[PDB]
């Protein structure tokens, strides 16, 4: 039996940024949800639609794991119907979203003295993002009525900003690793099943 590789998802060396969030497809394997209960400190383990107790006896076609790292205070922004910088410009979940959200502390791996600037988010944008939309554009944002000519200056800004994670921060400003499990089953034969 080929057990599904949730290990290479949760136990990765590095995660993805918020504006470029990583997506992994898993299928053609048997999935056990007891192993996922390892890594005892869980900041949040919340599921919508199906229940975690009844998750073991279910079948789907494919599963999609979306992984990234955010600030602690931003965790509550990874739920349906949430508003914020992360939920408006970086990562969006639909209102009818059915799936599981797992957020756990990562202060011991993703925090460096002097600033861990590898994690970035989007601050400015012309409009909001639609559900499951990823934007990696790097165009200059215009806040006035004069062409910027592709150079920053007065009323012309750079959209992407960077987190400064350090170990001495507070719990709310500490990095947190977030993984979202979305289950997709189709009218085709189901493939993802448990024991």
């Amino acid at each position, epitope marked *: 039996t080929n057990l599904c590789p949730f290990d290479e998802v949760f136990n990765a060396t590095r995660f993805a940024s918020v504006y470029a969030w990583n997506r*992994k*497809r898993i299928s*053609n394997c048997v999935a056990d949800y007891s192993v996922l209960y390892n890594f005892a400190p869980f900041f949040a383990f919340k599921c919508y639609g199906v229940s975690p107790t009844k998750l073991n006896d279910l079948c789907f076609t494919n599963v999609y794991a979306d992984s990234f790292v955010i600030r602690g205070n931003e965790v509550s922004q990874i739920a349906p119907g949430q508003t914020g910088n992360i939920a408006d410009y970086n990562y969006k979940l639909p209102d009818d979203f059915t799936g599981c959200v797992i957020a756990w502390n990562s202060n011991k791996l993703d925090s460096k003295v002097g600033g861990n600037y590898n994690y970035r988010y989007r601050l400015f944008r012309k409009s909001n*993002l*639609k559900p499951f*939309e990823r934007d990696i554009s790097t165009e200059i944002y215009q806040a006035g009525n004069k062409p910027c000519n592709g150079v920053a200056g007065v009323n012309c800004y750079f959209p992407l900003q960077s987190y400064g994670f350090r170990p001495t921060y507070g719990v709310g400003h500490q990095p947190y690793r977030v993984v979202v499990l979305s289950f*997709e089953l*189709l009218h085709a034969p189901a493939t993802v099943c448990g024991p």
Partner: antibody, heavy 122, light 108 residues
Framework: QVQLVESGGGVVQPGRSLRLSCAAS????????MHWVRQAPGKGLEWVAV????????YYADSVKGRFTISRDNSKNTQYLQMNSLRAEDTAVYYC???????????????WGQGTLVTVSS | DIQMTQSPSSLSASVGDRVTITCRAS??????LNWYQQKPGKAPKLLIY???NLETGVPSRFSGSGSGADFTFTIGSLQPEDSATYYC?????????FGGGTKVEIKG
């Protein structure tokens, strides 16, 4: 049992219009989003257009910019493409491909149609 | 945009050999590459998805490998039923770009 069927191809004189349709069965067509790709006779594949799930984000190729229009018909399980100002080298076989759900417009793979063939000659 | 090159453009192998294909990229695309098989007059069929993962209803002889920019595809015990054209495609960003292709002739 997911099936994609393309239709509307044929012969058209240069400088006219033509509409292609892709009919889908076996999934909730209203919230997935779709792609149009084409292959010239004796050449490789060439991506043409993509449309999101609702019908609010549309993306096109530069070589077909200003003449092609992608539309959805969420209800009829059909996706439509409109072609205008057709020129000499637009003869090809067109496939419609299933994408990733919601506004994930960079997904495609194991669900293709059989293709419909379009020529532009006098 | 994104430019990707397939090599070799043509390959010939005997019935009991091993065939390897290469596909490059002009930037880092991570595990966002997939391979297609196309017989003459038929739609492409997905063989390897997400940078070396196997799909349903495929022999175990088909195996991928790669990350970053350069990717490799490999076949195991070759069989007479493996004459087609193989394509690599990226799905990292805007307009999705295919490759030139590789035509495989079985020499007997």
């Amino acid at each position: 049992q997911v099936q994609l069927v393309e239709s509307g191809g044929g012969v058209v004189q240069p400088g006219r219009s033509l509409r292609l349709s892709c009919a889908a069965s076996g999934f909730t067509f209203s919230n997935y989003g779709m792609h149009w790709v084409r292959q010239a006779p004796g050449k490789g594949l060439e991506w043409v257009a993509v449309i999101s799930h609702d019908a609010s984000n549309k993306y096109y190729a530069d070589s077909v910019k200003g003449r092609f229009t992608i539309s959805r018909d969420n209800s009829k399980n059909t996706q439509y493409l409109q072609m205008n100002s057709l020129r000499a080298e637009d003869t090809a076989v067109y496939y419609c491909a299933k994408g990733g759900g919601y506004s994930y417009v960079v997904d495609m793979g194991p669900y293709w149609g059989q293709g419909t063939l379009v020529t532009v000659s006098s | 945009d994104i430019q990707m090159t397939q090599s070799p453009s043509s390959l010939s192998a005997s019935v009991g050999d091993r065939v390897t294909i290469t596909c490059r990229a002009s930037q880092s695309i991570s595990n966002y590459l997939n391979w297609y098989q196309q017989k003459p007059g038929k739609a492409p069929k997905l063989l390897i998805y997400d940078a070396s993962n196997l799909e349903t209803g495929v022999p175990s002889r088909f195996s991928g490998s790669g990350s970053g920019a350069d990717f490799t595809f490999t076949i195991g015990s070759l069989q007479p039923e493996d004459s087609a054209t193989y394509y690599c495609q990226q799905y990292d960003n805007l307009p999705l770009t295919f490759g030139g292709g590789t035509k495989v002739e079985i020499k007997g």
